[PDB]
Scaffold this active site. Structure first.
Site, PDB file in Angstrom:
ATOM      1  CB  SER A  58      24.714  56.206 -72.497  1.00  0.00           C
ATOM      2  OG  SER A  58      26.136  56.187 -72.517  1.00  0.00           O
ATOM      3  CE  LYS A  61      27.262  57.102 -69.295  1.00  0.00           C
ATOM      4  NZ  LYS A  61      27.454  57.347 -70.746  1.00  0.00           N
ATOM      5  CE1 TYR A 139      28.038  60.006 -71.987  1.00  0.00           C
ATOM      6  CE2 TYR A 139      28.704  59.823 -74.275  1.00  0.00           C
ATOM      7  CZ  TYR A 139      28.144  59.267 -73.145  1.00  0.00           C
ATOM      8  OH  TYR A 139      27.684  57.969 -73.157  1.00  0.00           O
ATOM      9  CD  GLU A 261      21.821  64.047 -72.223  1.00  0.00           C
ATOM     10  OE1 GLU A 261      21.723  64.538 -73.364  1.00  0.00           O
ATOM     11  OE2 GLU A 261      22.852  63.468 -71.809  1.00  0.00           O
ATOM     12  CE  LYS A 304      21.635  59.794 -71.063  1.00  0.00           C
ATOM     13  NZ  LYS A 304      22.458  59.411 -72.244  1.00  0.00           N
ATOM     14  CB  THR A 305      21.017  58.352 -77.225  1.00  0.00           C
ATOM     15  OG1 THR A 305      22.145  59.061 -76.699  1.00  0.00           O
ATOM     16  CG2 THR A 305      20.106  59.402 -77.844  1.00  0.00           C
ATOM     17  N   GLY A 306      21.485  55.481 -76.053  1.00  0.00           N
ATOM     18  CA  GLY A 306      22.489  54.588 -75.465  1.00  0.00           C
ATOM     19  C   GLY A 306      22.922  53.576 -76.507  1.00  0.00           C
ATOM     20  CB  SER A 307      25.286  53.201 -78.825  1.00  0.00           C
ATOM     21  OG  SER A 307      24.263  53.929 -79.483  1.00  0.00           O
TER      22      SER A 307
END
Length: 349
Positions: A58, A61, A139, A261, A304-307
């Site tokens: 993500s 994004k 989300y 964010e 930002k996180t993303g997995s």
């Protein structure tokens, strides 16, 4: 100094979460440093480097959002425009009163976290909103997925072309991909699932927009650095980056931008972890719009996180301090641990 605090936060992390490989990048004063641990592949024992390519989920994004911001800087689009304006097939009702802004900030009215080409279009046509546009944040990958598509539409070229032939070269990123080219294949880390089994992300509609980027810490910390300091970027990119770091609404101490964010800095790690939690992704939240959206101000943390199935990405930086950390892992380990580690490193810096 820094190398010892990074070592003493990531090594215990990597042992605790049994992570095969972790690369960390920090930047300060425009100057990057890389800390690399473990292996990109458990069979080959290929070492991790700042050129290793990871899936970032993500975090993709934010790249999508910068693409849309580039479309707006070039007069191809307004954030208040109805989505149906950019896709005829969506004309008829629904998407006539859902904005691009709505799609990009997940406030389109209840689009789900994930999809249950035109068969994805058909998904949208059959989709029944749960709530009025702009009222609740949910989300959702299909929401930012359509945001990117439509932004690409406005510019008369496909998403992938725009991103790779326009947006990324202009950010100075030559090791960031939608599709990993054949010559770079050996650099692509193997991902491992919760059980230690190998896995790479599986194709899907509008994946490229939602979770389809892969990159190294070297290119991603640069991405972070020009998002902090965009003054050398051409003007449309500068305007685009201003657009993504603009706050459009608040939700529990977190203020929402385009892809990114934002939070006050500093913040308790506890406040930061709860802001990146499981239910802050899966639960719907009503939203206090910013009647006049707020330009980026100092003392702000951007993150930002993303997995993916086998990858865990996290980005955190505070532009007014010029401080950035990037941590890329070939494990989807818990978000709380990502922010804890990022938070520690940032403090020490």
């Amino acid at each position: 100094d820094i190398r010892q605090v990074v070592d003493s936060t990531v090594e215990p992390l990597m042992q605790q979460q049994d992570i095969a490989g972790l690369s960390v990048a920090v930047i300060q004063n425009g100057k990057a440093q890389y800390f690399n641990y473990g292996v990109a592949n458990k069979d080959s024992k290929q070492p991790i480097t700042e050129n290793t390519l990871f899936e970032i989920g993500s975090v993709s994004k934010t790249f999508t959002a910068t693409l849309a911001g580039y479309a707006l800087a070039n007069g191809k689009l307004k954030l208040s425009d109805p989505a149906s304006q950019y896709l005829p097939a969506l004309r008829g009702d629904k998407f006539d009163h859902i904005s691009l802004l709505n799609l990009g900030t997940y406030t389109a009215g209840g689009l789900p976290l994930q999809f249950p080409t035109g068969k994805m279009i058909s998904y949208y046509q059959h989709w029944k909103p749960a709530f009025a546009p702009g009222t609740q944040r949910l989300y959702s990958n299909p929401s930012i997925g359509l945001f990117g598509h439509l932004a690409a539409q406005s510019l008369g070229q496909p998403f992938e072309k725009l991103m790779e032939q326009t947006v990324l070269p202009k950010l100075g990123l030559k090791h960031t991909f939608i599709s990993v080219p054949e010559t770079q294949m050996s650099l692509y880390a193997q991902g491992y699932d919760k059980a230690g089994k190998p896995v790479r992300v599986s194709p899907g509609a509008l994946d490229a927009e939602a979770y389809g980027i892969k990159t190294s810490t070297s290119d991603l910390i640069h991405y972070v650095e020009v998002n902090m300091h965009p003054a050398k970027l051409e003007k449309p990119l500068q305007q685009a980056i201003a657009a993504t770091h603009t706050g459009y609404y608040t939700v529990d101490g977190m203020t929402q931008g385009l892809g990114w964010e934002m939070y006050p800095y500093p913040i308790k790690v506890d406040a930061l972890v709860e802001g990146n939690s499981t239910q802050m992704a899966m639960e719907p939240h009503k939203v206090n719009w910013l009647t006049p959206p707020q330009a980026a101000p100092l003392d702000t943390l951007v993150n930002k996180t993303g997995s993916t199935g086998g990858f865990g990405a996290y980005v955190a930086y505070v532009p007014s301090k010029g401080l950035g950390v990037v941590i890329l892992a070939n494990k989807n380990y818990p978000n709380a641990e990502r922010v804890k580690a990022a938070h520690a490193i940032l403090s020490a810096m």
